[PDB]
Protein backbone atom coordinates (compact mmCIF):
# COMPACT_ATOMS: atom_id res chain seq x y z
CA UNK A 1 0.00 0.00 0.00
CA UNK A 2 1.23 3.48 -1.01
CA UNK A 3 -1.75 5.68 -0.08
CA UNK A 4 -4.64 5.81 2.38
CA UNK A 5 -7.67 8.10 2.19
CA UNK A 6 -9.22 8.56 5.62
CA UNK A 7 -13.05 8.83 5.67
CA UNK A 8 -15.72 9.00 8.33
CA UNK A 9 -18.01 5.96 8.42
CA UNK A 10 -19.78 6.43 11.82
CA UNK A 11 -20.09 10.09 12.95
CA UNK A 12 -19.31 10.98 16.57
CA UNK A 13 -22.50 13.09 16.77
CA UNK A 14 -24.73 10.16 15.71
CA UNK A 15 -24.42 8.35 19.11
CA UNK A 16 -27.60 9.86 20.55
CA UNK A 17 -28.20 7.04 23.12
CA UNK A 18 -24.63 6.77 24.46
CA UNK A 19 -22.02 9.15 25.82
CA UNK A 20 -19.37 9.55 23.10
CA UNK A 21 -17.44 12.62 24.34
CA UNK A 22 -16.22 11.33 27.74
CA UNK A 23 -14.14 8.44 26.36
CA UNK A 24 -10.75 9.79 27.46
CA UNK A 25 -7.78 8.94 29.72
CA UNK A 26 -4.68 10.41 31.38
CA UNK A 27 -2.74 7.65 29.52
CA UNK A 28 -3.44 9.50 26.24
CA UNK A 29 -2.67 13.18 26.97
CA UNK A 30 -2.99 16.05 24.49
CA UNK A 31 -1.85 19.56 25.49
CA UNK A 32 -2.08 18.70 29.21
CA UNK A 33 -5.64 17.28 28.99
CA UNK A 34 -6.96 13.70 28.87
CA UNK A 35 -7.63 12.56 25.29
CA UNK A 36 -7.87 9.30 23.27
CA UNK A 37 -7.18 7.56 19.96
CA UNK A 38 -8.78 10.01 17.50
CA UNK A 39 -10.12 7.44 14.99
CA UNK A 40 -12.16 5.37 17.41
CA UNK A 41 -14.84 6.32 19.91
CA UNK A 42 -14.77 5.03 23.51
CA UNK A 43 -18.54 4.83 24.23
CA UNK A 44 -19.88 4.79 27.81
CA UNK A 45 -23.31 4.77 29.50
CA UNK A 46 -25.66 7.78 29.30
CA UNK A 47 -27.93 8.71 32.26
CA UNK A 48 -27.06 5.29 33.79
CA UNK A 49 -27.97 3.17 30.76
CA UNK A 50 -26.07 1.32 28.04
CA UNK A 51 -28.72 0.08 25.57
CA UNK A 52 -27.77 -2.53 22.95
CA UNK A 53 -25.90 -0.96 20.00
CA UNK A 54 -26.79 -2.15 16.48
CA UNK A 55 -24.87 -0.32 13.74
CA UNK A 56 -24.23 -1.17 10.12
CA UNK A 57 -21.95 0.43 7.53
CA UNK A 58 -22.13 -0.44 3.80
CA UNK A 59 -18.94 -0.03 1.73
CA UNK A 60 -20.27 1.97 -1.23
CA UNK A 61 -16.74 3.03 -2.23
CA UNK A 62 -14.78 1.43 -5.09
CA UNK A 63 -11.82 0.88 -2.82
CA UNK A 64 -11.15 -1.81 -0.20
CA UNK A 65 -11.63 -0.28 3.26
CA UNK A 66 -9.50 -0.83 6.37
CA UNK A 67 -11.82 -0.75 9.41
CA UNK A 68 -10.50 -0.56 12.99
CA UNK A 69 -12.35 -1.15 16.26
CA UNK A 70 -11.68 -2.30 19.85
CA UNK A 71 -12.76 -3.76 23.19
CA UNK A 72 -12.07 -2.36 26.68
CA UNK A 73 -10.92 -4.82 29.36
CA UNK A 74 -11.74 -3.25 32.75
CA UNK A 75 -9.85 -3.52 36.06
CA UNK A 76 -12.69 -5.01 38.17
CA UNK A 77 -16.45 -5.73 38.36
CA UNK A 78 -17.09 -2.29 39.92
CA UNK A 79 -15.45 -0.43 37.01
CA UNK A 80 -17.51 -2.52 34.52
CA UNK A 81 -20.85 -1.39 35.97
CA UNK A 82 -19.39 2.11 36.58
CA UNK A 83 -18.66 2.62 32.86
CA UNK A 84 -21.20 0.35 31.13
CA UNK A 85 -23.80 -0.78 33.78
CA UNK A 86 -24.27 -4.28 32.34
CA UNK A 87 -22.11 -6.83 34.20
CA UNK A 88 -21.89 -9.32 31.28
CA UNK A 89 -21.26 -7.70 27.87
CA UNK A 90 -19.96 -8.52 24.39
CA UNK A 91 -19.18 -7.19 20.92
CA UNK A 92 -20.34 -9.11 17.86
CA UNK A 93 -18.91 -8.19 14.47
CA UNK A 94 -20.02 -9.62 11.11
CA UNK A 95 -19.19 -9.14 7.42
CA UNK A 96 -19.28 -11.30 4.28
CA UNK A 97 -16.46 -13.41 5.75
CA UNK A 98 -16.11 -12.23 9.36
CA UNK A 99 -18.03 -13.88 12.24
CA UNK A 100 -16.68 -12.46 15.50
CA UNK A 101 -17.91 -12.26 19.09
CA UNK A 102 -15.66 -10.62 21.70
CA UNK A 103 -16.14 -10.72 25.47
CA UNK A 104 -14.30 -8.49 27.96
CA UNK A 105 -11.87 -10.42 30.17
CA UNK A 106 -11.47 -9.05 33.69
CA UNK A 107 -8.27 -9.48 35.74
CA UNK A 108 -5.90 -7.71 38.10
CA UNK A 109 -3.13 -6.33 35.90
CA UNK A 110 0.04 -4.27 36.39
CA UNK A 111 -0.19 -0.53 35.73
CA UNK A 112 1.19 0.47 32.33
CA UNK A 113 0.92 4.26 31.84
CA UNK A 114 -1.02 4.19 35.13
CA UNK A 115 -3.78 1.91 33.79
CA UNK A 116 -4.88 -1.53 35.02
CA UNK A 117 -7.45 -1.69 32.22
CA UNK A 118 -6.52 -2.83 28.69
CA UNK A 119 -7.59 -2.10 25.11
CA UNK A 120 -7.50 -4.94 22.55
CA UNK A 121 -7.78 -3.68 18.97
CA UNK A 122 -9.04 -5.57 15.92
CA UNK A 123 -9.28 -4.97 12.19
CA UNK A 124 -10.70 -6.17 8.89
CA UNK A 125 -10.70 -5.30 5.19
CA UNK A 126 -14.24 -4.54 4.13
CA UNK A 127 -14.49 -5.24 0.39
CA UNK A 128 -16.63 -3.04 -1.90
CA UNK A 129 -20.38 -3.61 -1.78
CA UNK A 130 -20.02 -5.48 1.54
CA UNK A 131 -21.46 -4.38 4.87
CA UNK A 132 -20.01 -4.55 8.39
CA UNK A 133 -22.38 -5.15 11.32
CA UNK A 134 -21.80 -4.33 15.01
CA UNK A 135 -23.78 -5.31 18.09
CA UNK A 136 -22.74 -4.68 21.73
CA UNK A 137 -23.76 -4.41 25.41
CA UNK A 138 -20.71 -2.37 26.40
CA UNK A 139 -16.93 -2.14 26.30
CA UNK A 140 -17.20 -1.20 22.59
CA UNK A 141 -14.55 1.04 21.03
CA UNK A 142 -16.45 2.07 17.93
CA UNK A 143 -14.94 3.18 14.62
CA UNK A 144 -15.31 6.81 13.59
CA UNK A 145 -12.76 6.99 10.78
CA UNK A 146 -11.61 4.25 8.43
CA UNK A 147 -9.00 4.27 5.64
CA UNK A 148 -9.72 3.77 1.92
CA UNK A 149 -7.05 1.85 0.09
CA UNK A 150 -6.68 4.00 -3.04
CA UNK A 151 -3.22 3.08 -4.29
CA UNK A 152 -1.75 -0.45 -4.11
CA UNK A 153 1.88 -1.02 -5.18
CA UNK A 154 5.49 -1.66 -4.10
CA UNK A 155 6.32 -0.42 -0.63
CA UNK A 156 8.01 -1.52 2.56
CA UNK A 157 8.28 -0.71 6.27
CA UNK A 158 11.94 0.13 6.90
CA UNK A 159 13.32 -0.05 10.51
CA UNK A 160 15.61 2.88 11.15
CA UNK A 161 16.53 5.50 13.73
CA UNK B 1 -23.37 -40.11 20.56
CA UNK B 2 -20.26 -42.24 20.36
CA UNK B 3 -18.60 -43.96 17.39
CA UNK B 4 -15.78 -46.50 17.78
CA UNK B 5 -13.30 -46.91 14.92
CA UNK B 6 -13.29 -50.69 14.49
CA UNK B 7 -11.74 -50.41 11.00
CA UNK B 8 -8.04 -51.05 10.29
CA UNK B 9 -7.78 -47.70 8.51
CA UNK B 10 -7.45 -44.15 9.87
CA UNK B 11 -10.82 -42.39 9.52
CA UNK B 12 -11.46 -38.79 8.43
CA UNK B 13 -14.49 -37.51 10.41
CA UNK B 14 -16.28 -34.27 9.53
CA UNK B 15 -18.81 -32.27 11.54
CA UNK B 16 -20.06 -28.68 12.00
CA UNK B 17 -21.73 -25.89 13.98
CA UNK B 18 -24.51 -23.54 12.81
CA UNK B 19 -24.18 -19.85 13.66
CA UNK B 20 -27.69 -18.34 13.55
CA UNK B 21 -28.77 -14.84 12.48
CA UNK B 22 -30.46 -13.76 15.76
CA UNK B 23 -31.81 -14.94 19.14
CA UNK B 24 -35.25 -15.61 17.60
CA UNK B 25 -33.83 -17.98 14.97
CA UNK B 26 -31.85 -19.83 17.68
CA UNK B 27 -35.00 -20.72 19.68
CA UNK B 28 -36.93 -21.21 16.41
CA UNK B 29 -34.55 -24.00 15.27
CA UNK B 30 -33.16 -25.40 18.53
CA UNK B 31 -35.29 -23.98 21.44
CA UNK B 32 -32.38 -23.69 23.88
CA UNK B 33 -30.97 -20.12 23.92
CA UNK B 34 -27.46 -21.14 25.10
CA UNK B 35 -26.05 -24.23 23.38
CA UNK B 36 -22.73 -25.97 22.65
CA UNK B 37 -21.01 -28.91 20.96
CA UNK B 38 -18.40 -30.90 22.86
CA UNK B 39 -16.19 -33.31 20.92
CA UNK B 40 -13.66 -35.73 22.42
CA UNK B 41 -11.27 -38.44 21.22
CA UNK B 42 -7.96 -39.91 22.42
CA UNK B 43 -6.29 -36.57 21.65
CA UNK B 44 -9.14 -34.17 20.90
CA UNK B 45 -10.79 -32.04 23.63
CA UNK B 46 -13.15 -29.58 21.91
CA UNK B 47 -16.09 -27.43 23.00
CA UNK B 48 -17.77 -25.18 20.41
CA UNK B 49 -20.31 -22.44 21.12
CA UNK B 50 -22.48 -20.73 18.48
CA UNK B 51 -21.58 -17.06 17.96
CA UNK B 52 -24.54 -14.80 17.05
CA UNK B 53 -24.17 -11.62 14.97
CA UNK B 54 -25.71 -9.58 12.19
CA UNK B 55 -23.90 -10.67 9.02
CA UNK B 56 -24.07 -9.83 5.30
CA UNK B 57 -26.08 -12.18 3.08
CA UNK B 58 -23.93 -14.64 1.15
CA UNK B 59 -26.10 -16.90 -1.04
CA UNK B 60 -29.02 -15.19 0.72
CA UNK B 61 -27.98 -16.40 4.20
CA UNK B 62 -27.12 -14.35 7.30
CA UNK B 63 -26.39 -17.56 9.20
CA UNK B 64 -23.02 -19.34 8.93
CA UNK B 65 -21.69 -22.90 9.05
CA UNK B 66 -18.22 -23.52 10.59
CA UNK B 67 -16.87 -26.99 9.76
CA UNK B 68 -14.31 -29.06 11.71
CA UNK B 69 -12.45 -32.31 11.25
CA UNK B 70 -10.24 -34.92 12.86
CA UNK B 71 -8.44 -38.20 12.06
CA UNK B 72 -9.85 -40.92 14.25
CA UNK B 73 -7.17 -43.61 14.63
CA UNK B 74 -8.06 -47.31 14.75
CA UNK B 75 -9.46 -48.63 18.05
CA UNK B 76 -10.22 -45.02 19.17
CA UNK B 77 -13.68 -43.60 19.83
CA UNK B 78 -15.15 -40.15 19.05
CA UNK B 79 -17.69 -38.66 21.47
CA UNK B 80 -20.27 -35.95 20.78
CA UNK B 81 -22.50 -33.98 23.14
CA UNK B 82 -24.72 -31.02 22.22
CA UNK B 83 -27.67 -28.75 23.10
CA UNK B 84 -28.23 -27.58 19.51
CA UNK B 85 -26.60 -26.10 16.42
CA UNK B 86 -24.96 -29.50 15.79
CA UNK B 87 -24.21 -30.56 12.23
CA UNK B 88 -23.75 -34.28 12.83
CA UNK B 89 -21.68 -36.65 10.71
CA UNK B 90 -23.47 -39.27 8.65
CA UNK B 91 -20.65 -40.41 6.33
CA UNK B 92 -16.91 -40.45 7.02
CA UNK B 93 -13.98 -41.48 4.79
CA UNK B 94 -11.65 -44.43 5.40
CA UNK B 95 -8.07 -43.80 4.41
CA UNK B 96 -7.28 -47.02 2.54
CA UNK B 97 -4.34 -46.03 0.37
CA UNK B 98 -1.57 -43.63 1.44
CA UNK B 99 1.11 -42.58 -1.07
CA UNK B 100 2.49 -39.86 -3.39
CA UNK B 101 -0.11 -37.37 -4.58
CA UNK B 102 -0.67 -33.63 -4.97
CA UNK B 103 -3.42 -31.06 -5.44
CA UNK B 104 -2.71 -29.34 -8.78
CA UNK B 105 -4.27 -25.89 -9.50
CA UNK B 106 -5.48 -25.75 -13.12
CA UNK B 107 -8.36 -24.59 -15.28
C1 LIG C 1 -13.81 -49.81 20.48
O2 LIG C 1 -13.18 -48.86 21.30
C3 LIG C 1 -12.72 -49.53 22.45
C4 LIG C 1 -12.19 -48.51 23.44
O5 LIG C 1 -13.00 -47.33 23.40
C6 LIG C 1 -11.63 -50.47 21.88
O7 LIG C 1 -10.82 -51.42 22.65
C8 LIG C 1 -10.69 -52.83 22.04
O9 LIG C 1 -11.52 -53.46 23.01
C10 LIG C 1 -11.32 -54.75 23.60
C11 LIG C 1 -11.95 -54.69 25.00
O12 LIG C 1 -13.25 -55.29 25.01
C13 LIG C 1 -9.86 -55.19 23.69
O14 LIG C 1 -9.80 -56.57 24.07
C15 LIG C 1 -9.22 -55.00 22.33
O16 LIG C 1 -7.83 -55.33 22.41
C17 LIG C 1 -9.34 -53.58 21.72
N18 LIG C 1 -9.06 -53.92 20.28
C19 LIG C 1 -8.00 -53.56 19.60
C20 LIG C 1 -8.00 -54.15 18.22
O21 LIG C 1 -7.14 -52.84 20.09
C22 LIG C 1 -12.29 -51.50 21.02
O23 LIG C 1 -11.22 -52.33 20.56
C24 LIG C 1 -12.98 -50.91 19.86
N25 LIG C 1 -13.81 -51.97 19.29
C26 LIG C 1 -13.46 -52.99 18.50
C27 LIG C 1 -12.05 -53.16 18.03
O28 LIG C 1 -14.31 -53.78 18.13
C1 LIG D 1 -24.95 -2.20 0.23
O2 LIG D 1 -24.43 -3.53 0.39
C3 LIG D 1 -25.29 -4.48 -0.23
C4 LIG D 1 -24.88 -5.91 0.11
O5 LIG D 1 -24.32 -5.98 1.43
C6 LIG D 1 -25.22 -4.17 -1.73
O7 LIG D 1 -26.05 -5.09 -2.46
C8 LIG D 1 -25.71 -2.75 -2.01
O9 LIG D 1 -25.65 -2.51 -3.42
C10 LIG D 1 -24.93 -1.72 -1.20
N11 LIG D 1 -25.62 -0.44 -1.23
C12 LIG D 1 -25.65 0.47 -2.22
C13 LIG D 1 -24.92 0.29 -3.52
O14 LIG D 1 -26.30 1.49 -2.08
Q: How many CA atoms lie within 13 A of B40 on its CB side?
A: 6
In terms of Cα–Cα distance, which of B72, B69, B59, B67 is closest to B86?
B67
3-state secondary structure of A94: strand
The closest alpha carbon to A12, from A36, A39, A31, belongs to: A39
Which H or E run includes B95?
Answer: none
Backbone angles phi, psi at B70, to 5 degrees: -155, 160
Q: Are B36 and B86 in contact (CB under 8 A)?
A: no
Residue A69, phi-psi category: left (phi > 0), alpha (psi -120 to 50), beta (remainder): beta
CB burial of A21-49 (b: ≥16 within 10 Å; e: otherwise) equals eebebeeeeeeeeeebbeebbbbbbeeee
CATH number at residue A25: 3.90.209.20
Resolution (A): 3.7
What is the CB < 6 Å shell around ligand 2? A 58, 60, 129-131; B 56
Q: Give the structural domain span for A157.
A: 1-161
Residues linked to residue B34 through DSSP beta bridges, in sequence order: none
Is A94 within 8 Å of B58 when comparing Cβ atoms?
A: no
Q: Residue B55's closest chain A neighbor by CA?
A: A94
Q: Report the domain count for chain A.
A: 1
Residue A68, burial from CB neighbour count under 10 angstroms (0-12, 13-18, 19+): middle
Nearest CA to B63 out of A29, A123, A99 is that of: A99
Beta strands in A59-104 (DSSP E): 65-73, 91-94, 99-102
Residue pair B63/B23 in contact by the 8 Å Cβ criterion = no
Q: Is A82 on the interface with B (CB under 8 A)?
A: no
Query: CA torsion, points B38, B42, B44, B48, in degrees to nearest 10?
Result: 0
User: Rounded CA gap, A130 and A59, in Å?
Assistant: 6
Distance of CA B67 to the CA centre of its chain: 5
Report the alpha-carbon distance of residue A121 to residue B53 in Å, rounded.
19
Query: What is d(CA A34, CA A23) in angstroms, rounded to the nearest whole number?
Result: 9
Amino acid sequence: INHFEKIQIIPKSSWSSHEASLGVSSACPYQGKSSFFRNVVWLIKKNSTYPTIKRSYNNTNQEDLLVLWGIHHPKDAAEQTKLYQNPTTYISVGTSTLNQRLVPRIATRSKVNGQSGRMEFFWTILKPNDAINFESNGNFIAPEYAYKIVKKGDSTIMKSE
